[PDB]
Design a protein around this ligand. Sequence first.
Ligand SMILES: Nc1ncnc2c1ncn2[C@@H]1O[C@H](COP(=O)(O)OP(=O)(O)OP(O)(O)=S)[C@@H](O)[C@H]1O
Ligand SMILES: Nc1ncnc2c1ncn2[C@@H]1O[C@H](COP(=O)(O)OP(=O)(O)OP(O)(O)=S)[C@@H](O)[C@H]1O
Ligand SMILES: Nc1ncnc2c1ncn2[C@@H]1O[C@H](COP(=O)(O)OP(=O)(O)OP(O)(O)=S)[C@@H](O)[C@H]1O
Ligand SMILES: [Zn+2]
Lengths: 133, 303, 375, 70
Amino acid sequence: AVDTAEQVYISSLALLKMLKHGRAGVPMEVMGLMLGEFVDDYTVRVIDVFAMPQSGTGVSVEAVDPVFQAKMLDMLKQTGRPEMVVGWYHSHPGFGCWLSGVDINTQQSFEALSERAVAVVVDPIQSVKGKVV
Amino acid sequence: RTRLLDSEIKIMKSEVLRVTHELQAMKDKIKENSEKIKVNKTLPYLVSNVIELLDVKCAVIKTSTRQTYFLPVIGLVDAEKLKPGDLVGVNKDSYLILETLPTEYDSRVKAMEVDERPTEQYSDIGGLDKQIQELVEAIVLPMNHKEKFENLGIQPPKGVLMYGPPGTGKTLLARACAAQTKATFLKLAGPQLVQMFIGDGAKLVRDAFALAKEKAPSIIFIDELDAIGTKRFDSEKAGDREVQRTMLELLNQLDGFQPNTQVKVIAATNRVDILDPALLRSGRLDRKIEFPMPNEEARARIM
Amino acid sequence: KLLEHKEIDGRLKELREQLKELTKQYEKSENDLKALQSVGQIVGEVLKQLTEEKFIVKATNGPRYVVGCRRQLDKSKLKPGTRVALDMTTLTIMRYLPREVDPLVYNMSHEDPGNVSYSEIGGLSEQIRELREVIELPLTNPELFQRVGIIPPKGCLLYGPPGTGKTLLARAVASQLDCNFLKVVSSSIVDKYIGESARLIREMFNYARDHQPCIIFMDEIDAIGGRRFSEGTSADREIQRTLMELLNQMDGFDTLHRVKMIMATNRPDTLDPALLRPGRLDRKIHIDLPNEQARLDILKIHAGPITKHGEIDYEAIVKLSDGFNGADLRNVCTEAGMFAIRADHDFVVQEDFMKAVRKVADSKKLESKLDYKPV
Amino acid sequence: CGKTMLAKAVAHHTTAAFIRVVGSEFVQKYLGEGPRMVRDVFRLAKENAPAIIFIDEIDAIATKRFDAQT
Ligand SMILES: Nc1ncnc2c1ncn2[C@@H]1O[C@H](COP(=O)(O)OP(=O)(O)OP(O)(O)=S)[C@@H](O)[C@H]1O
Ligand SMILES: Nc1ncnc2c1ncn2[C@@H]1O[C@H](COP(=O)(O)OP(=O)(O)OP(O)(O)=S)[C@@H](O)[C@H]1O
Ligand SMILES: Nc1ncnc2c1ncn2[C@@H]1O[C@H](COP(=O)(O)OP(=O)(O)OP(O)(O)=S)[C@@H](O)[C@H]1O
Ligand SMILES: [Zn+2]
């Protein structure tokens, strides 16, 4: 569609939270939310990552508990930095990391809240030392 | 003036709950039926067999492609209706149990069913009236008046054999009782139980008996039983085996272990001395019925 | 005038009970709606452990693989021979499982119909006693055998003329102990495949290993037994390999325990001499035709629930009976009732019996060479 | 005539690695797994030690008449 320059910033804690939580629950796609700040049109700056709790024992299924939202963001308000949610993540642990049908399913419902809330995919398997990915 | 208006408005306060129950019926019914439309309209159902049933409510599946599958979630069937070895309809991609299929029956067994319903009344056979009496009083009355036996209280007889010279007529009574008795009359040619692949004649015999059992008034006719009935022998270097395996399957599924009361067997050979004694013994084929040549008047009757 | 309380509460009560019975449908079907998203998982066995995370399994339908585990699996539970549940796509381990049962086993484990006690059969009481001490004692009390210091026998062989009551005796035993009677018909084992019958034998004997006091019964061995060949038809190869599976796993290296094996057939002449060695089949137990006292016994068994009148010369019926089976006398009783159904005699007269004996002994003009003593 | 009784004693008194083999175990459902099992036994045999293989009842295997159709 109408595009802009494509640029995503990071935090250094983010990548570590991504790999740890995507490794500890590896054979099932583990939901996690992503937290940061929309600075402008074309750069997005994630600064914080908290993982989502799990549920029933099935691949790729995802949920956003709003009381978890309220209580987690409340704790981050009494923590030094409260900021705006910027998207979410999960893994595609055995493959070349494309968003699945459930992924685009939660994306068309999640896109009505934020425009450039970017979906991110960590993979703790196809990276060894010289890949993030 | 206070209570009746309170109840008439409490009919609306409970109509809030009635519209809530109508919502929980209809609107949730829309979503649940939408999902089961999205699953069940996938019309190819891979059929399979339930291998066992774990409980740590967990079923194990071998499909027809012979791939063993586990599932922790059973699906849209109930654990009462399941037993190890059942055909169920399974989604291809999800590998989820959808329906419950009736039986594992061969197309040849279905082809063995008698549906033409021939016509040959007992007046068409002349000169064999005593054997007709013995056959009818042996077979047709266990199909009709069972209480008459158990008032005397013994047993119904187990199967009737015809034998004799080859032109006295043994196909005639079979087509006759087909024309008269309205049970599931079931034909079976002799060498149809002979198979090439090792171990299918036993399956064929057992499927024949199973389709007889599930159509309970069941009259099974065998013609030229000596095709599979052969006197066994211990030799070396050579010997027919698999036909005796089918014969032993016929014996054991007929008589011995796990007896039955819903089967009726009619056999007819041209020669007698071929058979193993276990085929006849005295409770596999109960009433030995000889056929003589037509004496004098019977030939005139036939002509 | 205050019937408004019960009216409004009847509205609330019908709404509550119908809300329970109409939202429990929504509850169970919403559980189904959530459950529609589960994924089938591959069944396989673990060959061995490579590293702390690398595991090497074998899919049962085909190829081998190299997989990983979860993080909560207690990887010391993975041993060579276990059975696991593999992911469809990630292809990692989800769950360790107990061994499967191969439902052919289930159709002869619990399917077994019981019968009347051992007083139903008769006239061969010594063999009944003998089979009882060889079977019932060494699982109820083997230490008496241990005091002598000799291992009890493993398997027992029945043989005799057709229908002298072998299978019925096994049914009486299967009504007596009621522990683990795996009764194999020995004919629907072989199916159409290569190693299928061997795999069935493996499953049966491992199930015998699990549920330690087991009884194996194989009627009509002569399907699976054979003797030996110069390799005539290609189908006989698989039967001989199946029989060698039996011969191996009845002797082997891992010796059996408590698995008593009852074996019955018509003619043991056609049996394989490798099966007739003692130790695999210890005692050849003979069941012969009944004697005069024994024919009297079986006749007074089957004539139990038969409405008769007291002029019954049982001596004449047994005296005219010669070389009969138990089913011969059962057929005598049946056809005596048949003659009673003739001319509508609701009782059974003694004249029925002599005619029925004459019919039955008339019909046995056909079967000779009834003796086949083994070896 | 005491055939396996001596292999039992040899398995007892030895120090070497000893692998028992069921004769009909090689012929299985999936295709080609038989020769692969032969490879498996012999690779492990080459691996372990000065070792001993006992294969019971090779009459399941060595049959001098075939039929290359079935
Ligand atoms: N009352 C009768 N007695 C004898 N034969 C008759 C009679 N009525 C008709 N038939 C003839 O009998 C023929 C049937 O003979 P078959 O059934 O071929 O002999 P069979 O009893 O079948 O012996 P098979 O062929 O070994 S089973 C029919 O075609 C009729 O023409
Ligand atoms: N001693 C007996 N007491 C009572 N009924 C008996 C006796 N012996 C045989 N029968 C009857 O004969 C049949 C039992 O025979 P089985 O135990 O089945 O022997 P079998 O299975 O025929 O073995 P075969 O003939 O070698 S295949 C049943 O109809 C019994 O009622
Ligand atoms: N010195 C011995 N001579 C004979 N039998 C013995 C001897 N020592 C023990 N036995 C017992 O008799 C059995 C001999 O048979 P096996 O060793 O099993 O030979 P085999 O395996 O039966 O050969 P088969 O029948 O061709 S497979 C032993 O297993 C013991 O139960
Ligand atoms: Zn995904």
